[PDB]
Amino acid sequence: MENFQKVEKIGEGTYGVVYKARNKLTGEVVALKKISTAIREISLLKELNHPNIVKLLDVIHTENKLYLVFEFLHQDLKKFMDASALTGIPLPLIKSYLFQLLQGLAFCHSHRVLHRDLKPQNLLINTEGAIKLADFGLARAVVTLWYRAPEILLGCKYYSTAVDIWSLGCIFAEMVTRRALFPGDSEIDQLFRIFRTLGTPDEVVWPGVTSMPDYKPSFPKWARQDFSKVVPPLDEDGRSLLSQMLHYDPNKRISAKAALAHPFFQDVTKPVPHLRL
């Protein structure tokens, strides 16, 4: 856009290209995403400001096009995990990232705003130890299924803030194990990977599940596995929190606020990562 010089293509998300760009009236370096209800929704997001949410600087509807101007961060968690693959992210850094993302979510959720599409590529990091949620509230306004809550996969139309806790729990496990927890390549393959690990859900563990739109009585019935086998060598506190974040019933699943009081975070700190830019 006339005021912005494109520097580099950062990504080609579901919603449009994202470029690193430089503003000319200010010299600021930004991320520029090229995309009336959508405009009004998007405008609401300009006010949803928190230190763990990527700042939306400006929303330009010009030439009948939509550009979102975000603060720029230098690395995403996907690339940081790929870079830490041989050693693993240190637990204290895992714990700090998790706590910070929970603070982000607790904030958004308290305003009834859901992310809906959390994934390592949408979690951005800086040199100061911060992690932030990117593309927040845009879903309202190949796609990876790996982080999708089971209520979404079973066709619930009116899903809740719990869907974000599910996604962050999947990311948490991935930080710890250095492998995606549920790497499905179709909706049914995503659902069956979840069932193979957590057991096929039923009315005992999830009241009303059998009435969900895409629920089928013919689903194979797998027994649950042990978290000690899912995320070794995470400690008992981490495994307890993880289990609560991956409850099938969205109403039993831990909230962001309650997760912040979990004993896992008794000793949380804010380390600085080793970042090569």
Side-chain angles (χ1 to χ4, degrees):
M1 183 266 192
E2 88 186 27
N3 298 285
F4 290 102
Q5 72 196 234
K6 292 158 196 205
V7 176
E8 279 183 9
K9 192 168 300 195
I10 309 175
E12 290 186 329
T14 50
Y15 281 123
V17 187
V18 191
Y19 291 82
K20 183 186 187 169
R22 292 198 289 279
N23 184 326
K24 292 148 88 170
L25 60 110
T26 56
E28 70 208 284
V29 312
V30 300
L32 183 60
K33 181 181 275 206
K34 301 172 85 288
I35 299 296
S36 60
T37 62
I39 292 162
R40 282 177 215 120
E41 295 297 317
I42 280 304
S43 291
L44 292 153
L45 297 180
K46 294 181 91 292
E47 289 176 358
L48 188 75
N49 299 311
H50 177 286
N52 305 111
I53 297 304
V54 176
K55 180 166 189 183
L56 179 58
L57 300 186
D58 270 302
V59 177
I60 309 168
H61 186 204
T62 50
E63 280 90 71
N64 290 289
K65 300 159 164 195
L66 189 62
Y67 304 90
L68 308 189
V69 181
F70 288 104
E71 80 175 297
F72 174 82
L73 285 84
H74 284 84
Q75 186 149 304
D76 70 27
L77 188 72
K78 178 64 205 319
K79 294 182 204 187
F80 185 65
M81 281 193 300
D82 289 340
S84 312
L86 302 181
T87 56
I89 303 176
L91 183 69
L93 184 55
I94 296 176
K95 181 170 313 194
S96 171
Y97 284 178
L98 183 64
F99 185 84
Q100 287 180 64
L101 295 169
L102 299 161
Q103 289 181 294
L105 286 186
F107 176 79
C108 295
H109 294 174
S110 76
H111 291 98
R112 300 177 178 180
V113 174
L114 285 56
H115 187 295
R116 294 206 275 279
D117 200 18
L118 294 177
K119 57 201 173 173
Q121 281 176 333
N122 278 336
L123 295 183
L124 304 185
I125 63 177
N126 71 18
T127 53
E128 305 180 340
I131 191 163
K132 309 185 178 208
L133 302 157
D135 291 349
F136 209 108
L138 273 41
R140 194 202 267 177
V142 191
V143 83
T144 185
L145 296 173
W146 301 352
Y147 310 95
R148 295 251 180 272
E151 63 268 34
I152 301 169
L153 307 163
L154 288 169
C156 180
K157 299 178 173 186
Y158 299 127
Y159 54 74
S160 75
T161 58
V163 301
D164 293 334
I165 289 80
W166 179 275
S167 306
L168 186 57
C170 291
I171 295 174
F172 177 24
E174 191 173 339
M175 292 196 275
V176 167
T177 67
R178 306 175 249 181
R179 232 203 173 160
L181 177 62
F182 302 133
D185 62 5
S186 73
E187 282 185 276
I188 205 66
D189 186 60
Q190 187 65 33
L191 217 30
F192 292 176
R193 287 165 107 91
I194 297 168
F195 298 175
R196 286 177 225 140
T197 299
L198 306 179
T200 301
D202 62 12
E203 289 285 339
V204 171
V205 301
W206 191 356
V209 69
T210 61
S211 291
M212 295 274 162
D214 304 318
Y215 175 88
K216 316 277 165 196
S218 54
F219 279 156
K221 293 172 192 172
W222 289 274
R224 186 187 220 279
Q225 301 316 129
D226 292 332
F227 273 50
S228 56
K229 196 189 172 208
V230 180
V231 294
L234 192 60
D235 69 52
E236 205 74 40
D237 286 320
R239 277 187 275 114
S240 164
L241 173 64
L242 182 67
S243 70
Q244 298 191 109
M245 297 176 82
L246 299 174
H247 273 135
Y248 275 122
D249 188 338
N251 304 90
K252 293 189 189 89
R253 205 172 301 148
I254 191 169
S255 66
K257 231 179 171 203
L260 293 164
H262 192 281
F264 188 61
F265 296 116
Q266 199 87 63
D267 70 348
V268 64
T269 63
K270 196 190 185 181
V272 313
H274 185 59
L275 255 45
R276 283 180 190 182
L277 314 173

